[PDB]
């Protein structure tokens, strides 16, 4: 059995949890997973009440790893207050620039994710679960399909799992090129066989989701923590990392570092430590100019001492670290971010549709030295006016990183 080629992304851990197996760049099949005590947290979970599993996930303080940090236990609690049938969805759309943390769990330790999906589906009473994986992860899709079949053969999926009376089938859906399908309501629209257009929210999916039924959407990395919470118990989980932001976290580090890759570290690690202590510092020991938090925020060299946690002054986001050094042109970099939003707006909202397009079109003119004075003023205006009337997070942040480069690097923009 063969899979399409995947680059061997470097992975390193100080905690040996989510990267216990995924630190090795290869598929860990079910026999190897079972040797590490795999699926034993599922066995323990099936001997617990769904309410007790929600309680432990709540007490663990686990927060959503998809970027918004919503408390997981609280999300599941909301869904179970609504009558069934309920659905569980694993969000494997991972399409934000720089964010390659989820694919290494999918490709290398698929059973860790599957075990977490089964436990999570049992906890919310969902008998149908989905993995929605982006179309540009074909290897991850085939690895998951094969691992699901392995789990079914071992009796971890299907009807009456391990004599518990709990039924579950996991379906794997593929995306087809749209970053917006990572937004949970557009993901649901895509699972329904439609274009990936975000819905007005509230209602949150826990109230009205797939086929208008209570639906929990959780990110791959969030789900991969669930077997650890059950296996170790919530108290031992709360003892990982700092007491206020407990648990392991994956940090995808790229750009101008010596050792780019995924680092599993506690959340009290600073951004400076991620770059210098772990990722080996910068290429050619050149000065750090900026860190792009995916396509969301831009941190300057004066902001490297912030913790990589979910605090107000913390790095936040998905812990995506893209390092730019002194040689990297900030305007050329801002243009690539503008191009990303131009390419990914779904077009439902007028200021988002026209603003994402104009921001990239005008920024290209500025970069190429073809912009008029009106093009410069128009660009500033457009960048500030993408968010109005937006119904999803994309319109709200399409100008964010670019505005931060204008504020933090005025001298470079001034040259253009």
């Amino acid at each position: 059995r063969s899979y399409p080629a995947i680059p061997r992304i470097y992975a390193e851990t100080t905690l040996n949890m989510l990267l216990k197996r995924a630190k090795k760049p290869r598929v860990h099949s079910i026999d190897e997973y079972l040797k590490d005590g795999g699926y034993q947290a599922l066995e323990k979970a099936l001997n617990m009440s769904p309410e007790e599993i929600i309680d432990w996930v709540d007490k663990s303080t686990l927060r959503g790893r998809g970027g918004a940090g919503f408390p997981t236990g609280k999300k599941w609690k909301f869904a179970v207050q609504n009558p069934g049938p309920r659905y569980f969805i694993c969000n494997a759309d991972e399409s934000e620039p720089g964010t390659f943390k989820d694919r290494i769990i999918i490709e290398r330790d698929p059973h860790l994710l599957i075990e977490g999906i089964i436990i999570s589906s049992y906890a919310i009473g969902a008998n149908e679960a989905y993995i929605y994986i982006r179309g540009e992860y074909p290897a991850g899709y085939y690895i998951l399909r094969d691992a699901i079949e392995e789990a079914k053969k071992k009796g971890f999926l299907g009807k009456n799992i391990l004599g518990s009376g709990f039924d579950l089938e996991i379906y794997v859906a593929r995306g087809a090129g749209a970053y917006i399908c990572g937004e949970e309501t557009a993901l649901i629209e895509s699972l329904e066989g439609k274009r990936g257009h975000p819905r007005l929210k509230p209602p949150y999916p826990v109230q009205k989701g797939l086929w208008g039924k209570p639906t929990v959407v959780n990110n791959v990395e969030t789900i991969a923590n669930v077997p650890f919470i059950i296996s170790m118990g919530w108290e031992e989980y709360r003892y990982i990392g700092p007491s206020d932001y407990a648990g392991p976290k994956l940090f995808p580090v790229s750009g101008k570092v010596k050792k780019p890759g995924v680092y599993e570290l506690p959340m009290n690690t600073t951004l400076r430590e991620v770059i210098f202590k772990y990722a080996g510092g910068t290429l050619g020991n050149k000065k750090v100019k900026a860190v792009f938090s995916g396509a969301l925020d831009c941190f300057s060299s004066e902001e490297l001492d912030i913790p990589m946690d979910y605090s107000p002054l913390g790095f936040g986001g998905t812990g995506t670290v893209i390092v730019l050094t002194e040689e990297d042109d900030i305007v050329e970099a801002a243009l690539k971010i503008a191009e990303f939003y131009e390419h990914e707006t779904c077009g439902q909202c007028t200021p988002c549709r026209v603003g994402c397009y104009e921001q990239a079109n005008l920024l290209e003119k500025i970069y190429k030295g073809e912009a008029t004075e009106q093009d410069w003023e128009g660009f500033d205006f457009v960048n500030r006016n993408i968010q109005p009337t937006s119904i999803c997070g994309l319109g709200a942040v399409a100008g964010r990183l670019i505005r931060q480069t204008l504020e933090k690097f005025p001298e470079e923009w001034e040259k253009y």
Binding site: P4, A5, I6, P7, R8, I9, Y10, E94, S95, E96, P97, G98, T99, F100, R103, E128, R134, G135, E136, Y137, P138, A139, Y171, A173, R174, G175, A176, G177, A178, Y179, S190, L191, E192, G193, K194, R195, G196, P252, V253, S254, G255, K256, P260, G261, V262, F292, A295, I322, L324, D328, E332, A333, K336, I337, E339, F340, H343, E344
Partner: protein, 155 residues
């Protein structure tokens, strides 16, 4: 028009996979593009019938999703990441190497219909930048000599 029996059986497998037929639309379109090297305009009506959807719904779905190509037939799609990290790490060197080897630029197809260069957004293998795919396979670009050897595997 009628789908060949080898493709029809794969489409029927996807259609019967999810609880509802219409959920299989993207998997069916991926299967059609794999078989033909693009989405032939004549395939949209027989697919709509199989999914029990109106033709307009299927056409709107094909138009929305970036991976689907209704215009150019290509045996091998070379997806080149044109996003931020690969830009910083050498997308321009990868594009130059591809033009030197194949004689084509992004959006173009070789005369034999063998390769098409498709510029794409972040493929999220950024630590291995610059990134490209050749159909389902994904790689880090190192140099022209290395790229030439990779492309020689696609016959």
């Amino acid at each position: 028009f009628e789908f060949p029996e080898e493709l029809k059986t794969k489409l029927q497998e996807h259609i019967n996979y999810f609880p509802k037929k219409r959920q299989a639309i993207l998997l069916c379109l991926h299967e059609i593009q794999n078989y033909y090297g693009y989405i032939p305009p004549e395939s949209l009506k027989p697919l709509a019938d199989m999914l029990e959807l109106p033709l307009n719904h299927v056409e709107g779905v094909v138009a929305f999703y970036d991976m689907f190509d209704r215009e150019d037939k290509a045996k091998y799609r070379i997806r080149v990441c044109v996003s931020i990290v690969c830009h910083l790490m050498g997308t321009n060197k990868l594009l130059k190497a591809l033009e030197n080897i194949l004689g084509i630029k992004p959006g173009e197809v070789t005369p034999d219909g063998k390769f098409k260069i498709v510029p794409v957004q972040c493929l999220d293998a950024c630590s291995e930048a610059p990134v490209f795919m050749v159909n389902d396979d994904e790689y880090k670009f190192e140099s022209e000599v290395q790229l030439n050897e990779i492309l020689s595997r696609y016959t």
